[PDB]
């Protein structure tokens, strides 16, 4: 088997330089090759460079030549990429790929990635989310059912997990993608639906965990009549 292991979340100010890693394992390291790719929240793919660690040869895209460098060392069994002139547009998910397609008739296409590293470039600073619940009214019920939820605001940096703590209580839970404020802070929304026989009395509690610092935040939602 062949596998790739990537680092955790990394963030830096604009105009800086950053180091990233891609740990390779399994089989023989000398027979593998590594490539790097970037994936935004819906923009097209970008390919940074390519290296053959056994032989040390590398090449680049015109967009990233000069400003980016790759080094890989067998002894540490990981591949490295060097980045410079970071800017806000670099905020995306950064992936490392293995190009095994060079020695068996399969040519110049990857078939293995790691777990992917999310990256962000902003002037903000790390801090936890701000959460506030809402109070639906009984007159607002629809078809004998109602919904409750929470909004997550003012957290940085990502990734962020928004959910309800545990159990089947999560029935009818529904969440939507994140948005980024002009101040440099992320946001999220969540909702859960409840029938008449369980709304209010169930005492629903929304939860958030800012795993870059592993800070847990929770809040209660209460209807009214």
């Amino acid at each position: 088997q062949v596998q790739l292991v990537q680092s955790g979340a990394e963030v830096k100010k604009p105009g800086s330089s950053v180091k990233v890693s891609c740990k390779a394992s399994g089989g023989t390291f000398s027979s593998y090759a590594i490539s790097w790719v970037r994936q935004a929240p819906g923009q097209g793919l970008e390919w940074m460079g390519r290296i053959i660690p056994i032989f040390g040869t590398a090449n680049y895209a015109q967009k990233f030549q000069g400003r980016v460098t790759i080094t890989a060392d067998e002894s540490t069994s990981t591949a490295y990429m060097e980045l410079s002139s970071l800017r806000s547009e670099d905020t995306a998910v950064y992936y490392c790929a293995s190009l095994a397609s060079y020695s068996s008739g399969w040519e110049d296409v990857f078939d293995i990635w790691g777990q992917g590293t999310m990256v962000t470039v902003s002037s903000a600073s790390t801090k936890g989310p701000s959460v506030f619940p809402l109070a639906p009214s009984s007159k607002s019920t629809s078809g004998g059912t109602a919904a409750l939820g929470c909004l997550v605001k003012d957290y940085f940096p990502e990734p962020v997990t928004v959910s309800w703590n545990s159990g089947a209580l999560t029935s009818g839970v529904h969440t939507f993608p994140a948005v980024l404020q002009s101040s440099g802070l992320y946001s999220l929304s969540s909702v859960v639906t409840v029938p008449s026989s369980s709304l209010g009395t169930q005492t629903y509690i929304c939860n958030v965990n800012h795993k870059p610092s592993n800070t847990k935040v929770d809040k209660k939602v209460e209807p009214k009549s």
């Binding site: 895209a61 506030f132 809402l134 078809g143």
Partner: protein, 213 residues
Amino acid sequence: DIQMTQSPSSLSASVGDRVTITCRASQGISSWLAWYQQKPGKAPKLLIYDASNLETGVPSRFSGSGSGTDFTFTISSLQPEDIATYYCQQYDNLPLTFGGGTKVEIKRTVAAPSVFIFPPSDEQLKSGTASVVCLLNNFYPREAKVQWKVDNALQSGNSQESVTEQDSKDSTYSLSSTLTLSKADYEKHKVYACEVTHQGLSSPVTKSFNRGE
């Protein structure tokens, strides 16, 4: 440099229907063109690397052909788990160029949205900011008008929207919008409302709440 395009940009068909797509490139070639199966934020799966060629492990469910500047890519059958975006890639030369994408999804009968609105709370207003959310749940089409009607008057240019992908379990789709205001502008008005109209709905729907209650 090499540039390419894909047409059409989106496909919709029922479960088990045949699907086909085509990709165009700048220069005429007969090999060294690839195809990919990609989903939002997920890893592509390789199906074709050279014109009409595939590896061990590629399912027989995919195929491709063509010559010159136009190459076709066909899928024998569609299922809900296949909701993804097909892509063409080319590597005759080092400046690898990647396709414009073609969405593929599931056709279904019209589903009426479940409509609800999301009035503010006190802790929200104490921060100086005000916002309200209007949600449409499990409706088929890509968008349905979510109109803010503060004081029974239409509003525009002051809301944010978020979107979900098609639900593979039942091929439905959801949408919502979020109004934003300051507490002063919030209290300048008295009645809040959101209106929804939809293809499967009998008539326009209005949901509202008031500052005095």
